[PDB]
Amino acid sequence: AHHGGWTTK
Amino acid sequence: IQRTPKIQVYSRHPAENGKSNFLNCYVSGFHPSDIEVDLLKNGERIEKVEHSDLSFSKDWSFYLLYYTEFTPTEKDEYACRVNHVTLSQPKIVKWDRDM
Amino acid sequence: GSHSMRYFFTSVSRPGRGEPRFIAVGYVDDTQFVRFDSDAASQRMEPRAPWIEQEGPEYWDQETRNVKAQSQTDRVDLGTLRGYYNQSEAGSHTIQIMYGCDVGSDGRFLRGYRQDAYDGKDYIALNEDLRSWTAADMAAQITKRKWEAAHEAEQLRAYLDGTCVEWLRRYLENGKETLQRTDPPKTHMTHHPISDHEATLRCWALGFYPAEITLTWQRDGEDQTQDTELVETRPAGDGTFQKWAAVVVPSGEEQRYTCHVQHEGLPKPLTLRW
Secondary structure: OOOOOOOOO | OOOOOOEEEEOOOOOOOOOOOOEEEEEEEEEEEOEEEEEHHHHHHHHOOOOOOEEEOOOOOOEEEEEEEEEOOOOOOEEEEEEEOOOOOOOEEEOOOOO | OOOEEEEEOOOOEEOOOOOOEEEEEEEEEOEEEEEEEEEOOOOOOOOOOOOOOOOOOOHHHHHHHHHHHHHHHHHHHHHHHHHHHOOOOOOOOOEEEEEEEEEEOOOOOEEEEEEEEOEEEEEEEOOOOOOEEEEOOHHHHHHHHHHOOOHHHHHHHHHHHHHHHHHHHHHHOOOOOHHHHOOOOEEEEEEEOOOOOEEEEEEEEEEEOOOOEEEEEEOEEEEEEHHHHEEOEOOOOOOOEEEEEEEEEEEEHHHHHHHHHHHOOOOEEEEEEE
């Protein structure tokens, strides 16, 4: 499973 | 910024006339990702042609595999036609069973 | 041996022709097992290996939503980086992302990684310690300060050295019948005259897995190096790989050249002579 966390650049 | 694709035209198994095989065209090392790849039989485009999902290498350049099942005959000519933004005209690479 | 799980993401803007093209692919070693294509009809994360199909409906719902959220993140970042680098809205640009983890033969965590790119060049990357970032230029430093203040590294680390390892261990067990295989390369040499005085010696390696392999030519013990044509390793289409290396030799001196093959599926490196 891939990562479910994000922060825009 | 832009890198031209390296083209390889080859069969999955050792070529033998009369026996079903798989014709591959492997394009790699190109950027940007937009590319047009066709498999040709006697100069005409082959309809049933599949391709792998877009991925890239460590240097971020992209690679794709286009493939279709075919029965190689000694009379028919096969090639891969690739168009890319780095090319002034579509590049045609003939299939050579020694490569 | 060691193993890896890696996810690859590509977002390509196409202004005036709709939303950016988004393609995501997941690998265990050199074996793809999931994919997502924004232009495909299903709009779902799809299986690409037999051993992943047994995952339940929640797994595919979760992977589809998370991979769609990554695409929406790339959509915002494409416009943001467009402003960072002072570029117009007319051009097409690309964001690429790769991350994953490695484990040993005993399943222990070895390393984790994440690297991001913009237009095929390095943008920002996580360091080996999984605690700090390295920006490739002053524009990417803006993202680094934003990710530092948000403590993004600590969130990503818990995945890379934890959740990523947990899933890789399960995939390696579920697909043990096909992921633990190592096919040695089948080796042979060919000979092609190019004139009355010279000929091409081509050294072949076929049907090997994984893709990592080494082909070198040698002349009287003296290494050949820049007189060799080496093609990129290519997939056969059935899960194995191919590669060859060629050298133009004078006719009658073929006995002076030797091909050397190195692959982890080989007990001792092979030496071929025509």
